Design a protein around this nucleic acid. Sequence first.
RNA 1: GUGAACGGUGGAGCAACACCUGAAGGAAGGCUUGAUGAGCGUGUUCCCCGCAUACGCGGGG
Length: 73
Amino acid sequence: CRQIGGKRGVGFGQVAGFKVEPVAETDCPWSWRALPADADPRLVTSEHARCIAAIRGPYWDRTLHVEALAPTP
RNA sequence: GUGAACGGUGGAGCAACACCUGAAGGAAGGCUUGAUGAGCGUGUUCCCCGCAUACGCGGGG
């Protein structure tokens, strides 16, 4: 990877660096994520809400948008 | 297959016009280039200082 985010053709947001380190199981919210509509409720927090949204793959593909429980940036 | 992928802030436009740094104001009052240094007296062994180390040298008045 060298850039992150959108509009990468006009040079926005090239990555200066990254660090990848292990963390505790209770210390990671991985569930802050576009979850399915029938996701198990220990992963569905108050930030998660119902939306027409992709949970996987190409997140821009509106044909693959599903009943989803997703948080907000 | 980074809600990604694609996407020109662009084109044009006078800081310019006119405007006296100028009026007044004493470099003067006093001051020998004249000297100064240019020539005019003593008539024979008397103190003291160093090198020596006394055989003598230099030397103060």
